């Protein structure tokens, strides 16, 4: 997250931190995700496609720091890794960038809701806020595009939804943005998602519910004028989600 503010997991208690175990036992951060039910985390397929074996991943909930433990946190193995069949990546962007992880503790349990671990609601089908609406993004991604390191402390910021017409201007991304994607950005382009925020939640208030509106997917640079962040449009994937979680 470029700009924005540091936060803690109580402010985004559905946030899941996803790591990958390596050849030698070392463990590195992969992507964010969101807890949509006690056994299911939703994220992006591009986070997993290069190493698609479920055994190589660990998921934490209730975690506020990247490489240190947070009191109350829970650690999970991945019982099932479900990637979207129609995923693609071009030279620029990702399509159908959505993924589901079924989580299970070494004791065979799912998540236990607490002050630091809660689920987020899915949206009504094809139901999205008006453009101009302010939404939150959360992640352990880079604080600056040129940084080598990731922040140790979770961050969050606010961006506004951009109309599909505006985002599809060649001025922005042209045809690379589809109806199954959502664009959001800061009016001054001063805050944004960045490298390592992928898979994480874009959360808006529709009616009176905090709702998972998007999943961090792609973008040209970070906090770059006329280059918004692009998000998987969750309200367009409800049959796929329900079908695979039933």
């Amino acid at each position: 997250i470029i700009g924005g503010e540091f936060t803690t997991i109580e402010n985004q208690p559905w946030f899941a931190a996803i790591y990958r175990r390596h050849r030698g036992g070392s463990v590195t951060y992969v992507c964010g995700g969101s807890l949509i039910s006690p056994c299911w985390v939703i994220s992006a397929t591009h986070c997993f496609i290069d190493y698609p074996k479920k055994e190589d991943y660990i998921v934490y909930l209730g975690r506020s720091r990247l490489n240190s433990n947070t009191q109350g946190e829970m650690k999970f193995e991945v019982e099932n890794l479900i990637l979207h069949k129609d995923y693609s990546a071009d030279t620029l962007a990702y399509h159908n960038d959505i993924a589901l992880l079924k989580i299970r503790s070494k004791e065979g349990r799912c998540a236990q809701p607490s002050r630091t671990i809660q689920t987020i609601a899915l949206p009504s089908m094809y139901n999205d806020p008006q453009f101009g609406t302010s939404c939150e993004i959360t992640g352990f991604g880079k604080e600056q595009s040129t940084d080598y390191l990731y922040p140790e402390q979770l961050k969050m910021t606010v961006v506004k939804l951009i109309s599909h017409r505006e985002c599809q201007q060649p001025h922005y991304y042209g045809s690379e943005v589809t109806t199954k994607m959502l664009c959001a950005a800061d009016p001054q382009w001063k805050t944004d998602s960045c490298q390592g925020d992928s898979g994480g939640p874009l959360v808006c208030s529709l009616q009176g519910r905090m709702t998972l509106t998007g999943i961090v997917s792609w973008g040209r640079g970070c906090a770059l004028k006329d280059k918004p962040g692009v998000y998987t449009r969750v309200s367009h994937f409800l049959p796929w989600i329900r079908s695979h979680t039933k």
Binding site: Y29, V30, H46, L92, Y94, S198, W218, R220, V230
Partner: peptide, 10 residues
Amino acid sequence: CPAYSAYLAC
């Protein structure tokens, strides 16, 4: 890796 990726391994 696509050019506009935010995957940390890219």
